[PDB]
Amino acid sequence: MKLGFIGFGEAASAIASGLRQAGAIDMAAYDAASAESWRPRAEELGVSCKASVAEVAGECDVIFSLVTAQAALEVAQQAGPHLCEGALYADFTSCSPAVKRAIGDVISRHRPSAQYAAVAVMSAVKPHGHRVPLVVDGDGARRFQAAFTLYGCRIEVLDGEVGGAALLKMCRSAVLKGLEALFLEALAAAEKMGLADRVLASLDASFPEHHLRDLALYLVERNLEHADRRAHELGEVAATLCSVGVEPLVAEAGYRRLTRVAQVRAALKQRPGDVRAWLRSLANA
Amino acid sequence: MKLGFIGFGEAASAIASGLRQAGAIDMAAYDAASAESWRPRAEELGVSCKASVAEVAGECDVIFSLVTAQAALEVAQQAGPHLCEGALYADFTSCSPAVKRAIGDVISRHRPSAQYAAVAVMSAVKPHGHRVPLVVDGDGARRFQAAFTLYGCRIEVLDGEVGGAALLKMCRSAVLKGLEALFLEALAAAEKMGLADRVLASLDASFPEHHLRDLALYLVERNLEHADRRAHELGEVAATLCSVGVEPLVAEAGYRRLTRVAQVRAALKQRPGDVRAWLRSLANA
Ligand SMILES: [Cl-]
Ligand SMILES: [Cl-]
Ligand SMILES: [Cl-]
Ligand SMILES: [Cl-]
C-alpha cells in the first residue's frame, strides 16, 4: 500500500509515526505550510515529501486528508482528478456533516471507482497516535476499517448517512468542552467569595454517583494545560450545530467563555501552580 | 414563637405545613396576590391571614420573607420599621448577594436590635417541605439554625460575608441548569441524525466513573416535567453572576436554550411519552 497524507501537522505525523512502527507501509506527504515547518519531521519518519496535492493523489492508492476544516473541500476538489482507479480517500477533518457529504460527492464525480471514508477523530491524537479512536461512515468505511485494523487502528463503522460520524464527534465535543466552559464560568464566579470548593462539595453531596467535583477538577486541570485547542474546537462545534439546524446558543457562549479564559491564561506573566489558584486568578481577573 | 410569612406561595405553604406537624408554632401570613390565591391554603394550615407586610412585621418575632427576588428589597423596607425589638428577619429569596447585604442593612437601620438570616434554599422545596436544605449567613444565622433545627430543619451556617449562601446557591444552579441546557442542545442536535444514544454511549465509555449517560437522561427527564421553573432559575443565576462581576456568557445562553425548549414543550398538543421521544421532538422542531 502507498499511503499519502495531505497535511502533515502534529496529529498527522503522530499517525504516520504510529503506522511506521505498526508495519511495512510506503508513505508520502504534502503540507501547504512552509517546508521548514513539516519536511524535517516527514523525512525523519521516512515519508516521501511532495510538491502538491495533485502529486500525492496521483502516486498513492490511499489518501488521508488531515487539513483544517476550512480547507477540507478545496483539498478534495484538488485531489479528485488525480486519484488512481479504486483509490480510497479518507477525510479526517473536523468539517461539518454537510461538508463530509460534499467531499464524498467530489470524489465520486472525479473518480467514480474510488471509495470514501468520512473519518471522525474521536479525541485528541497525541495520547494515542495511530490508535486514536476513529468512527467512520461513507462507502469506503468498511474498507478503511479492514485495511487499518491490520496496523492496530481503533475503528468503528457507523451504519448510517455520510456525515453521521462527524456529527457524533461534534456533539460529544459540545458536551465535553461545554462542561469545561460551564465549570470555568460558575466556579470563577463562586471564587469571587472563595466558594468554588463549597459549590463542588454541594454538587457531590446531591449527585454522589456522578462524581462532579472530580469531573470539574479534571476539566479545569486540562484547561490549565490545553486551553487554546479546546476553545477553537468549541467554535467548530458551534458551526456544525448551526449547519444541522440547531442555533448554537450554548455552544457559541461556551466558545466565547473558553476564549476569554485563554486570554486571562495568556496575560499571566507566570501561570498558576494548581487548579485552585487558576480558579482564583480567573475570579480576580 | 410567633412566625410570620411574607409571601404564601407553594414553597412557603409547604414550609408552613411542615413546621405545623413538626411542633407547636403560632403562624401568620400575608401575600400581595389576590385573596382567593392564598387565603384558603393558609386558613387550612391554621395560619392567621394578614392585610399588610406592616401587620405581619408588627405581630411576629420571626419573619420569613419568601417573595420573588425582585420584591425582596422593597418587602424588607416595608417590614423594617414595624419589626419588634430583637426580631429575627430571615430572607429566603433568590435575590443576588449584593441584595441580601442591602436587605440586612435595611433591617439594621430600622431595628438595630433585630438579627438577620440571609437564607439560601439549596434545591426545590416540594420534595422536602420544611426539611429543604438551607445554607445561611448573616448575624442571625446561628440563631436561625438553633431555632429551626428544633423543628427538623436542615440548616448549615456559612462562616463568611453576608450573600455567600446566595452565591453558593446560584453557582450550584448555574452548573445544574447549565448541564440540563447543554445536554438538551447537544442531544437535540445529535438526534437530527438519531445519534443522541451514541453520543451518550461515547461519553460513558470515555468517563465511566462519572455516569454521564445516566446524568443526561435524569436531567432531560426532569426537563420533560419541570421545564418552566428551571428556565426562570437560570435567568436569575445569570443576573447573580453579572452582579458579582462575571459576564454570564454561558448562563444567559443556557437560559435562552431552556426558554426555547419550554416553548417547544408548550407548543405540543400532547407531550412525548419518554426522554427519547422528547429529544426527537426537539430535533424535529
Ligand atoms: Cl488532536
Ligand atoms: Cl435551536
Ligand atoms: Cl421551590
Ligand atoms: Cl467574565
TrEMBL record, chains A, B:
Domain Pyrroline-5-carboxylate reductase catalytic N-terminal: 2-88
Pfam families reported for this sequence: DUF1932, F420_oxidored
Domain Phosphogluconate dehydrogenase NAD-binding putative C-terminal: residue ranges: 190-261
Transmembrane segments: none
Protein name in UniProt: NAD-binding phsophogluconase dehydrogenase-like protein
Species the sequence originates in: Alicyclobacillus acidocaldarius subsp. acidocaldarius (strain ATCC 27009 / DSM 446 / BCRC 14685 / JCM 5260 / KCTC 1825 / NBRC 15652 / NCIMB 11725 / NRRL B-14509 / 104-IA) (Bacillus acidocaldarius)
